[PDB]
């Protein structure tokens, strides 16, 4: 019954049960190494570990870097221990996360922010190496201390950048958590309105939008419906560009320039 964790300089309340070994669980308090994600039972043991631990960032390859923001690609097979610890840590904040131990079939995309002591964990998403259903995200998490600052949408944007470069369309693995659904709705909205703002033509197929954005046709239609931009006039379906939504976006996109909370495709260095 873990209530709290000490993670670097933060003290975080947990949301859900995670299956940590019982003799850790019963303390109700875990001390975590912020770099290798090893869990320990006291401050003093943590302090001892930090003196020995060489890790200043996630394992795997740094495939994105824009200044202090990185994304590391970590192979569940090559770095089993790290990926399990990450999954156990994630399940403290995920209601729905199934698995924690069998991480070999998964890639983990771990987003970090650098300061003078190292590259600190912001969040991550996991991805099946080979998904039967072409899911481009399995679970996604922003660490609580970083929530609602724009990092989540950057992680989501990053998941779709990978899909674009793979020349696939993608979708998050069902089921979507409540906060998952909200974040994805905000992102889908943003990219759909951006597309329609830039697009000059007289008509588009859902297919064409999906091809550009890597977003799944169903998710596009779902968003069009959400914004009440699908209509039916004289026996055919029309995309209705709402002026309120247009004006709202250019306003929201005027503050997106000075935000710095943006994934920049030119800062990716990756091949599947």
């Amino acid at each position: 019954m873990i209530k709290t964790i000490a993670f670097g300089r933060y003290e975080l309340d947990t949301w859900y049960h995670s299956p940590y070994p019982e003799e850790y669980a019963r303390l109700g308090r875990l001390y975590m190494c912020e770099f290798c994600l090893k869990y320990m039972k006291s401050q003093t043991i943590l302090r001892r570990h930090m003196a020995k631990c060489v890790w200043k960032h996630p394992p795997g390859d740094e495939i994105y870097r824009k200044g202090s923001i990185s994304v590391f690609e970590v192979d569940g097979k090559k770095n089993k221990i790290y990926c399990q610890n990450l999954c156990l840590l994630a399940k403290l904040f995920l209601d729905h996360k199934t698995l924690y131990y069998d991480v070999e079939p998964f890639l983990f995309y771990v987003m970090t922010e650098a300061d003078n002591t190292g590259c600190h964990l912001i969040g991550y998403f996991s991805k099946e190496k080979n998904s039967f259903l072409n899911y481009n995200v399995s679970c996604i998490l922003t660490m609580p201390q970083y929530m609602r600052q724009g990092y989540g949408k950057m992680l989501i944007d990053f998941s779709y950048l990978l899909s674009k470069v793979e020349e696939k369309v993608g979708s998050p693995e069902r089921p979507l958590s409540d906060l998952g659904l909200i974040s994805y709705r905000s992102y889908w909205k943003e990219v759909l309105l951006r597309y329609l703002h830039n697009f000059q033509g007289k008509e588009i197929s859902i297919k064409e939008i999906s091809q550009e954005t890597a977003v799944n046709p169903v998710d596009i239609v779902s968003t069009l419906q959400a914004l009440q931009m699908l209509k039916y006039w004289k026996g055919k379906h029309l995309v209705l560009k709402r002026q309120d939504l247009i004006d709202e976006w250019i306003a929201k996109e005027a503050k997106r320039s000075n935000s710095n909370k943006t994934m920049d495709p030119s800062c990716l260095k990756w091949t599947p």
């Binding site: 007289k202 008509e203 197929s205 859902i206 999906s210 039916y232 209705l240 002026q243």
Partner: peptide, 27 residues
């Protein structure tokens, strides 16, 4: 390559491949 949706009380079936017209809020 279809989808089902309810728009203002009606129920509709929409193709993914068919181009749909873009309107700029007219009658």
């Amino acid at each position: 390559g279809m989808v089902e949706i309810e728009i203002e009380g009606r129920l509709h079936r929409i193709s993914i491949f068919d181009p749909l017209e873009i309107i700029l809020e007219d009658d």
